[PDB]
C-alpha cells in the first residue's frame, strides 16, 4: 500500500528545464533571466491546479558550448532579489554590489547548484489576484492591472562571462529548477483551453474546444 | 417540510430546513487574534437580499464577486469605502422558486480568485482586458459569455471541487453555502481585491410546456459573518 | 383582525368588493411596486 | 394529514383534523338548570347534511338562518312544529372541495340577529320589506344581493368580530364553527325568532384556467348540541 507518488512533493520535486541562455561570439554581452516557474511549458497547468502555494526551490545551471564542448571559462551567475536593480550593462555596479549574491564557477567544474528560499511578503504565492494593484483608484492607462501580484516576484538570474574582455567561447547556459517542501491550498479545476499569455488566464474565445476526445454518438463505441 | 421563520437585526427571511441545509469548507468563519503577522456586532449582520435575477430557457449563467457585490451599496457598503482594510465571512443563501412542473439543475459554487478573461478579437489586435464593469460587476452581477470554460479556460466539469450545492427543482429549491475568509494576508483592501466569486450555472437547462411562465426567479439572500475592520478614512 | 380596504376603486358598486383584495400577476415582473398605504388609522382612509 | 372516520347516531361523515379544527365563542353549548328566570339524547344528535350549494366564478355569497334552515325538514324539524319553545347549540362544519389548481378565499361567519334589508325602489314608493321567503329561507338558503353591506348596511370588512374561519383552498378546505345559544330569553319560539344566521362570503373570487370544472361545491354538514324543548302541541 503506497500513495506517496501522489504527494505534492512527489508530484513537483523534479528538476526541470526552465532557462535557455545563449552567449554568442557574433548580443550585447550579457543576459538577465527573470525567474518564472513557467518556461517549463507544462508547469503552469500543473501549478494552477491549486491557488495558494508555498515552497523552497533548487536551481541548477548546466553550461556548455553549442557544440557541447566543455571549455575552461569562468562564469558568474548572480541572483538579483526583488526591488533590487537589474544590471544596466556589462559593467554596471550591479555585479559588484555583492548584496546580490554571486556564484563564480568554471565549466570544467560540475553544474553549480544553489537553493532559493520562499521569497514572498505574503504568507504564500498566488497565481490569481482578482483585483487591482496597490492601490488602484485613479485614472486608467491600463495594461498592467490583471492577474498580477508583484508580491510574487521571485527575483532574477544574471550571467557574465566574465569581464573584462569578451569571451572567445560561444556559450549556452541551461537553467534547471526544482521545488521542495511544497504546500498548496484551495484547489482549482485544471485548464482545458490553450494558453496565450503569461500572468493571465485568457483564452481564444473564437476557438473553444471540448475538453477531451469525442465519439460519433453516445450509444456507440 | 417545515414552516419558515428566519430573521436577523431587522431583516426577515422565509426559508426551509428539510434537506441538507448548509455546506462549509470544513472551517467556520471566525475573528482573528494575531499580531497582523473594529467588530461590528448587531448592525452589519443583516440579510442583504440581492436583486432576484430571472432565468430564461436559454441562459448560460451568472456570477457575483464578493465583496464587490455589496461594496458600493448598503450599510455594509458604507463601512468599506471609509475603511481600507477588510476581512469577513458570508452566509450565502440561494433559492429559486418554481412549480413541480418546471425543471433544470443549477450549480451554486464559489471559486476564489475568479480571474476572468474575455475573447481576443475586435479589430485584428492581439491583447485586451475586461473593463471595470466586468471584473467588479456589483449587485446586478454579470451574465458571463462562455460558461463551459467559465470565461477563464476552466472547464465546469470539475468545479465541484469547490463548495457547491446542487439545485434540482425536482427535489430541492434551496442552496446555502457558508464561506470563510481566504487570503494570503489576514487583511486586504475591499476595493481592489475581490476575493471569492459566487457563480450560478445551469447544466440541465430549464424546460417546461409552454404558457407556464417561461421565467423562474433566482432569489439571492446573503449575510456577512465575523466581519472586521481596522483603520478608517474621512468622509466626502 | 378586520379586513383592510387597500384597493380603492368604486366602479361603480359592482366592483366595490375589489377593495379588499390585491392584484398579483406574472407581468410585468420583478422590482416594480405592487401596492402601498398609509400607517395611520385616523387618516382617511383605507383603514376606515 | 389524517384519514377520515366520523359518525354519529346513524349518520357518518368523512372530515379531517390537520389544521385548526374548531372555533368557539369562548363558551361551549350547555343545558340549563334555572327557574326560567325535554332532553333529546341519541336521536336529534345527527349530522344533518344540508344541500351542497355550488360556487361559480361570479358568486357573491349565501346565508342560512338557524334554526329556520332545518325547522321545516327533518326529524329535528318535527320537534320544532309540535313544540313552541326552543333552545340549542350547533356543530356547523363547512367544507368545500377543490383541486390545488383552484383558488378563492371564503368567509365563514355567524352573525346573530341577521336582520336583513332589501332595496327601496320598484315603483317610486318609499317603504318595502322582504317576503317570508327571504327572512326565513330554509335549507336551500338564499344567495344575497348586496354582499359588501350584507344586505344590511353592514360592511363585510368588519365581520371577523364574530366567530369565523377562513377557507383558502391553498391551505385549508374545511371550516368548523361551534355556536352556543344566544338570546335575551333562555327560551324562544323556533318558528318566529330565527337566531344567528350563518353566512359564506367569497372575498378573493374563485379563478382557474378554463376547462377545469368552473364549479366547486360547498358541503354544509351541521349537528345540534344540547338541544332542549319544553311544552308541546298536538299533531295535524
PDB file of N, CA, C and O in Angstrom, chain D residues 165-211:
ATOM      1  N   UNK D 165     -64.002  31.435  10.303  1.00  0.00           N
ATOM      2  CA  UNK D 165     -62.808  30.738   9.965  1.00  0.00           C
ATOM      3  C   UNK D 165     -62.616  30.796   8.457  1.00  0.00           C
ATOM      4  O   UNK D 165     -63.554  30.570   7.678  1.00  0.00           O
ATOM      5  N   UNK D 166     -61.395  31.112   8.059  1.00  0.00           N
ATOM      6  CA  UNK D 166     -61.113  31.342   6.671  1.00  0.00           C
ATOM      7  C   UNK D 166     -60.897  30.043   5.931  1.00  0.00           C
ATOM      8  O   UNK D 166     -60.267  29.115   6.434  1.00  0.00           O
ATOM      9  N   UNK D 167     -61.420  30.003   4.716  1.00  0.00           N
ATOM     10  CA  UNK D 167     -61.207  28.873   3.848  1.00  0.00           C
ATOM     11  C   UNK D 167     -60.432  29.334   2.636  1.00  0.00           C
ATOM     12  O   UNK D 167     -60.988  29.952   1.733  1.00  0.00           O
ATOM     13  N   UNK D 168     -59.140  29.056   2.627  1.00  0.00           N
ATOM     14  CA  UNK D 168     -58.348  29.357   1.459  1.00  0.00           C
ATOM     15  C   UNK D 168     -57.891  28.030   0.887  1.00  0.00           C
ATOM     16  O   UNK D 168     -57.119  27.305   1.517  1.00  0.00           O
ATOM     17  N   UNK D 169     -58.377  27.718  -0.308  1.00  0.00           N
ATOM     18  CA  UNK D 169     -58.164  26.409  -0.913  1.00  0.00           C
ATOM     19  C   UNK D 169     -56.691  26.117  -1.135  1.00  0.00           C
ATOM     20  O   UNK D 169     -56.319  24.996  -1.474  1.00  0.00           O
ATOM     21  N   UNK D 170     -55.857  27.132  -0.958  1.00  0.00           N
ATOM     22  CA  UNK D 170     -54.426  26.918  -0.933  1.00  0.00           C
ATOM     23  C   UNK D 170     -54.080  26.034   0.254  1.00  0.00           C
ATOM     24  O   UNK D 170     -53.533  24.944   0.086  1.00  0.00           O
ATOM     25  N   UNK D 171     -54.406  26.502   1.454  1.00  0.00           N
ATOM     26  CA  UNK D 171     -54.094  25.749   2.661  1.00  0.00           C
ATOM     27  C   UNK D 171     -55.213  24.791   3.033  1.00  0.00           C
ATOM     28  O   UNK D 171     -55.095  23.578   2.864  1.00  0.00           O
ATOM     29  N   UNK D 172     -56.308  25.355   3.530  1.00  0.00           N
ATOM     30  CA  UNK D 172     -57.374  24.578   4.146  1.00  0.00           C
ATOM     31  C   UNK D 172     -58.648  24.553   3.303  1.00  0.00           C
ATOM     32  O   UNK D 172     -58.997  25.549   2.673  1.00  0.00           O
ATOM     33  N   UNK D 173     -59.349  23.423   3.308  1.00  0.00           N
ATOM     34  CA  UNK D 173     -60.609  23.305   2.583  1.00  0.00           C
ATOM     35  C   UNK D 173     -61.764  23.000   3.523  1.00  0.00           C
ATOM     36  O   UNK D 173     -62.837  22.588   3.087  1.00  0.00           O
ATOM     37  N   UNK D 174     -61.547  23.222   4.814  1.00  0.00           N
ATOM     38  CA  UNK D 174     -62.551  22.898   5.815  1.00  0.00           C
ATOM     39  C   UNK D 174     -62.704  24.014   6.832  1.00  0.00           C
ATOM     40  O   UNK D 174     -61.733  24.660   7.214  1.00  0.00           O
ATOM     41  N   UNK D 175     -63.931  24.217   7.291  1.00  0.00           N
ATOM     42  CA  UNK D 175     -64.210  25.214   8.307  1.00  0.00           C
ATOM     43  C   UNK D 175     -65.214  24.632   9.274  1.00  0.00           C
ATOM     44  O   UNK D 175     -66.188  24.006   8.862  1.00  0.00           O
ATOM     45  N   UNK D 176     -64.981  24.842  10.561  1.00  0.00           N
ATOM     46  CA  UNK D 176     -65.860  24.290  11.574  1.00  0.00           C
ATOM     47  C   UNK D 176     -66.042  25.277  12.717  1.00  0.00           C
ATOM     48  O   UNK D 176     -65.083  25.640  13.392  1.00  0.00           O
ATOM     49  N   UNK D 177     -67.278  25.714  12.919  1.00  0.00           N
ATOM     50  CA  UNK D 177     -67.598  26.654  13.982  1.00  0.00           C
ATOM     51  C   UNK D 177     -68.662  26.048  14.887  1.00  0.00           C
ATOM     52  O   UNK D 177     -69.616  25.438  14.409  1.00  0.00           O
ATOM     53  N   UNK D 178     -68.496  26.227  16.191  1.00  0.00           N
ATOM     54  CA  UNK D 178     -69.463  25.754  17.169  1.00  0.00           C
ATOM     55  C   UNK D 178     -70.101  26.951  17.851  1.00  0.00           C
ATOM     56  O   UNK D 178     -69.411  27.779  18.443  1.00  0.00           O
ATOM     57  N   UNK D 179     -71.423  27.044  17.752  1.00  0.00           N
ATOM     58  CA  UNK D 179     -72.145  28.207  18.245  1.00  0.00           C
ATOM     59  C   UNK D 179     -73.117  27.836  19.347  1.00  0.00           C
ATOM     60  O   UNK D 179     -73.933  26.934  19.182  1.00  0.00           O
ATOM     61  N   UNK D 180     -73.022  28.531  20.488  1.00  0.00           N
ATOM     62  CA  UNK D 180     -73.945  28.335  21.606  1.00  0.00           C
ATOM     63  C   UNK D 180     -75.221  29.150  21.423  1.00  0.00           C
ATOM     64  O   UNK D 180     -75.286  29.984  20.523  1.00  0.00           O
ATOM     65  N   UNK D 181     -76.215  28.910  22.269  1.00  0.00           N
ATOM     66  CA  UNK D 181     -77.482  29.631  22.200  1.00  0.00           C
ATOM     67  C   UNK D 181     -77.355  31.057  22.735  1.00  0.00           C
ATOM     68  O   UNK D 181     -76.910  31.265  23.863  1.00  0.00           O
ATOM     69  N   UNK D 182     -77.753  32.032  21.924  1.00  0.00           N
ATOM     70  CA  UNK D 182     -77.567  33.442  22.255  1.00  0.00           C
ATOM     71  C   UNK D 182     -78.880  34.218  22.203  1.00  0.00           C
ATOM     72  O   UNK D 182     -79.356  34.560  21.123  1.00  0.00           O
ATOM     73  N   UNK D 183     -79.461  34.499  23.366  1.00  0.00           N
ATOM     74  CA  UNK D 183     -80.731  35.225  23.426  1.00  0.00           C
ATOM     75  C   UNK D 183     -81.005  35.916  24.757  1.00  0.00           C
ATOM     76  O   UNK D 183     -80.469  35.533  25.796  1.00  0.00           O
ATOM     77  N   UNK D 184     -81.861  36.932  24.710  1.00  0.00           N
ATOM     78  CA  UNK D 184     -82.269  37.663  25.900  1.00  0.00           C
ATOM     79  C   UNK D 184     -83.183  36.812  26.766  1.00  0.00           C
ATOM     80  O   UNK D 184     -83.368  37.090  27.948  1.00  0.00           O
ATOM     81  N   UNK D 185     -83.761  35.780  26.164  1.00  0.00           N
ATOM     82  CA  UNK D 185     -84.579  34.829  26.899  1.00  0.00           C
ATOM     83  C   UNK D 185     -83.940  33.451  26.812  1.00  0.00           C
ATOM     84  O   UNK D 185     -83.389  33.087  25.774  1.00  0.00           O
ATOM     85  N   UNK D 186     -84.001  32.677  27.904  1.00  0.00           N
ATOM     86  CA  UNK D 186     -83.411  31.340  27.867  1.00  0.00           C
ATOM     87  C   UNK D 186     -84.183  30.426  26.925  1.00  0.00           C
ATOM     88  O   UNK D 186     -83.688  29.363  26.554  1.00  0.00           O
ATOM     89  N   UNK D 187     -85.381  30.849  26.535  1.00  0.00           N
ATOM     90  CA  UNK D 187     -86.195  30.081  25.604  1.00  0.00           C
ATOM     91  C   UNK D 187     -87.031  30.995  24.714  1.00  0.00           C
ATOM     92  O   UNK D 187     -87.596  31.981  25.187  1.00  0.00           O
ATOM     93  N   UNK D 188     -87.104  30.664  23.427  1.00  0.00           N
ATOM     94  CA  UNK D 188     -87.938  31.400  22.477  1.00  0.00           C
ATOM     95  C   UNK D 188     -88.499  30.480  21.398  1.00  0.00           C
ATOM     96  O   UNK D 188     -88.021  29.361  21.216  1.00  0.00           O
ATOM     97  N   UNK D 189     -89.523  30.958  20.696  1.00  0.00           N
ATOM     98  CA  UNK D 189     -90.136  30.215  19.595  1.00  0.00           C
ATOM     99  C   UNK D 189     -89.185  29.997  18.414  1.00  0.00           C
ATOM    100  O   UNK D 189     -88.526  30.928  17.953  1.00  0.00           O
ATOM    101  N   UNK D 190     -89.118  28.758  17.937  1.00  0.00           N
ATOM    102  CA  UNK D 190     -88.258  28.400  16.814  1.00  0.00           C
ATOM    103  C   UNK D 190     -88.866  28.829  15.485  1.00  0.00           C
ATOM    104  O   UNK D 190     -88.192  28.838  14.458  1.00  0.00           O
ATOM    105  N   UNK D 191     -90.149  29.165  15.509  1.00  0.00           N
ATOM    106  CA  UNK D 191     -90.888  29.443  14.289  1.00  0.00           C
ATOM    107  C   UNK D 191     -90.748  30.895  13.856  1.00  0.00           C
ATOM    108  O   UNK D 191     -90.642  31.196  12.668  1.00  0.00           O
ATOM    109  N   UNK D 192     -90.744  31.791  14.834  1.00  0.00           N
ATOM    110  CA  UNK D 192     -90.842  33.216  14.565  1.00  0.00           C
ATOM    111  C   UNK D 192     -89.661  34.028  15.075  1.00  0.00           C
ATOM    112  O   UNK D 192     -89.697  35.253  15.043  1.00  0.00           O
ATOM    113  N   UNK D 193     -88.642  33.353  15.595  1.00  0.00           N
ATOM    114  CA  UNK D 193     -87.431  34.041  16.026  1.00  0.00           C
ATOM    115  C   UNK D 193     -86.181  33.301  15.578  1.00  0.00           C
ATOM    116  O   UNK D 193     -85.586  32.537  16.336  1.00  0.00           O
ATOM    117  N   UNK D 194     -85.807  33.516  14.324  1.00  0.00           N
ATOM    118  CA  UNK D 194     -84.564  32.977  13.791  1.00  0.00           C
ATOM    119  C   UNK D 194     -83.384  33.671  14.453  1.00  0.00           C
ATOM    120  O   UNK D 194     -83.219  34.884  14.322  1.00  0.00           O
ATOM    121  N   UNK D 195     -82.582  32.906  15.187  1.00  0.00           N
ATOM    122  CA  UNK D 195     -81.430  33.461  15.884  1.00  0.00           C
ATOM    123  C   UNK D 195     -80.309  33.834  14.932  1.00  0.00           C
ATOM    124  O   UNK D 195     -80.509  34.560  13.961  1.00  0.00           O
ATOM    125  N   UNK D 196     -79.122  33.320  15.220  1.00  0.00           N
ATOM    126  CA  UNK D 196     -77.951  33.601  14.411  1.00  0.00           C
ATOM    127  C   UNK D 196     -78.093  33.059  13.001  1.00  0.00           C
ATOM    128  O   UNK D 196     -78.717  32.023  12.782  1.00  0.00           O
ATOM    129  N   UNK D 197     -77.508  33.769  12.047  1.00  0.00           N
ATOM    130  CA  UNK D 197     -77.515  33.330  10.669  1.00  0.00           C
ATOM    131  C   UNK D 197     -76.110  33.059  10.178  1.00  0.00           C
ATOM    132  O   UNK D 197     -75.265  33.950  10.209  1.00  0.00           O
ATOM    133  N   UNK D 198     -75.846  31.831   9.750  1.00  0.00           N
ATOM    134  CA  UNK D 198     -74.551  31.509   9.171  1.00  0.00           C
ATOM    135  C   UNK D 198     -74.502  32.145   7.793  1.00  0.00           C
ATOM    136  O   UNK D 198     -75.517  32.203   7.103  1.00  0.00           O
ATOM    137  N   UNK D 199     -73.332  32.624   7.389  1.00  0.00           N
ATOM    138  CA  UNK D 199     -73.188  33.157   6.043  1.00  0.00           C
ATOM    139  C   UNK D 199     -71.796  32.885   5.485  1.00  0.00           C
ATOM    140  O   UNK D 199     -70.809  32.907   6.215  1.00  0.00           O
ATOM    141  N   UNK D 200     -71.737  32.629   4.182  1.00  0.00           N
ATOM    142  CA  UNK D 200     -70.493  32.320   3.497  1.00  0.00           C
ATOM    143  C   UNK D 200     -70.249  33.344   2.402  1.00  0.00           C
ATOM    144  O   UNK D 200     -71.035  33.455   1.466  1.00  0.00           O
ATOM    145  N   UNK D 201     -69.167  34.102   2.526  1.00  0.00           N
ATOM    146  CA  UNK D 201     -68.870  35.146   1.559  1.00  0.00           C
ATOM    147  C   UNK D 201     -67.473  34.983   0.990  1.00  0.00           C
ATOM    148  O   UNK D 201     -66.496  34.922   1.731  1.00  0.00           O
ATOM    149  N   UNK D 202     -67.384  34.891  -0.339  1.00  0.00           N
ATOM    150  CA  UNK D 202     -66.098  34.847  -1.029  1.00  0.00           C
ATOM    151  C   UNK D 202     -65.518  36.247  -1.155  1.00  0.00           C
ATOM    152  O   UNK D 202     -66.201  37.143  -1.643  1.00  0.00           O
ATOM    153  N   UNK D 203     -64.286  36.445  -0.704  1.00  0.00           N
ATOM    154  CA  UNK D 203     -63.638  37.737  -0.875  1.00  0.00           C
ATOM    155  C   UNK D 203     -62.727  37.669  -2.088  1.00  0.00           C
ATOM    156  O   UNK D 203     -62.928  38.398  -3.055  1.00  0.00           O
ATOM    157  N   UNK D 204     -61.724  36.801  -2.041  1.00  0.00           N
ATOM    158  CA  UNK D 204     -60.958  36.509  -3.241  1.00  0.00           C
ATOM    159  C   UNK D 204     -61.799  35.579  -4.098  1.00  0.00           C
ATOM    160  O   UNK D 204     -61.999  34.423  -3.739  1.00  0.00           O
ATOM    161  N   UNK D 205     -62.318  36.089  -5.224  1.00  0.00           N
ATOM    162  CA  UNK D 205     -63.253  35.298  -6.022  1.00  0.00           C
ATOM    163  C   UNK D 205     -62.533  34.120  -6.652  1.00  0.00           C
ATOM    164  O   UNK D 205     -61.346  34.232  -6.954  1.00  0.00           O
ATOM    165  N   UNK D 206     -63.234  33.007  -6.837  1.00  0.00           N
ATOM    166  CA  UNK D 206     -62.640  31.840  -7.470  1.00  0.00           C
ATOM    167  C   UNK D 206     -62.134  32.128  -8.877  1.00  0.00           C
ATOM    168  O   UNK D 206     -62.834  32.736  -9.684  1.00  0.00           O
ATOM    169  N   UNK D 207     -60.910  31.698  -9.163  1.00  0.00           N
ATOM    170  CA  UNK D 207     -60.381  31.779 -10.514  1.00  0.00           C
ATOM    171  C   UNK D 207     -59.658  30.476 -10.815  1.00  0.00           C
ATOM    172  O   UNK D 207     -59.253  29.752  -9.903  1.00  0.00           O
ATOM    173  N   UNK D 208     -59.506  30.189 -12.102  1.00  0.00           N
ATOM    174  CA  UNK D 208     -58.917  28.949 -12.577  1.00  0.00           C
ATOM    175  C   UNK D 208     -58.598  29.116 -14.045  1.00  0.00           C
ATOM    176  O   UNK D 208     -59.077  30.061 -14.671  1.00  0.00           O
ATOM    177  N   UNK D 209     -57.795  28.224 -14.611  1.00  0.00           N
ATOM    178  CA  UNK D 209     -57.730  28.194 -16.060  1.00  0.00           C
ATOM    179  C   UNK D 209     -59.010  27.506 -16.508  1.00  0.00           C
ATOM    180  O   UNK D 209     -59.625  26.773 -15.740  1.00  0.00           O
ATOM    181  N   UNK D 210     -59.410  27.747 -17.744  1.00  0.00           N
ATOM    182  CA  UNK D 210     -60.671  27.238 -18.276  1.00  0.00           C
ATOM    183  C   UNK D 210     -60.648  25.801 -18.774  1.00  0.00           C
ATOM    184  O   UNK D 210     -59.669  25.325 -19.345  1.00  0.00           O
ATOM    185  N   UNK D 211     -61.758  25.119 -18.515  1.00  0.00           N
ATOM    186  CA  UNK D 211     -61.936  23.721 -18.841  1.00  0.00           C
ATOM    187  C   UNK D 211     -61.240  23.023 -17.699  1.00  0.00           C
ATOM    188  O   UNK D 211     -60.286  22.266 -17.878  1.00  0.00           O
TER     189      UNK D 211
END
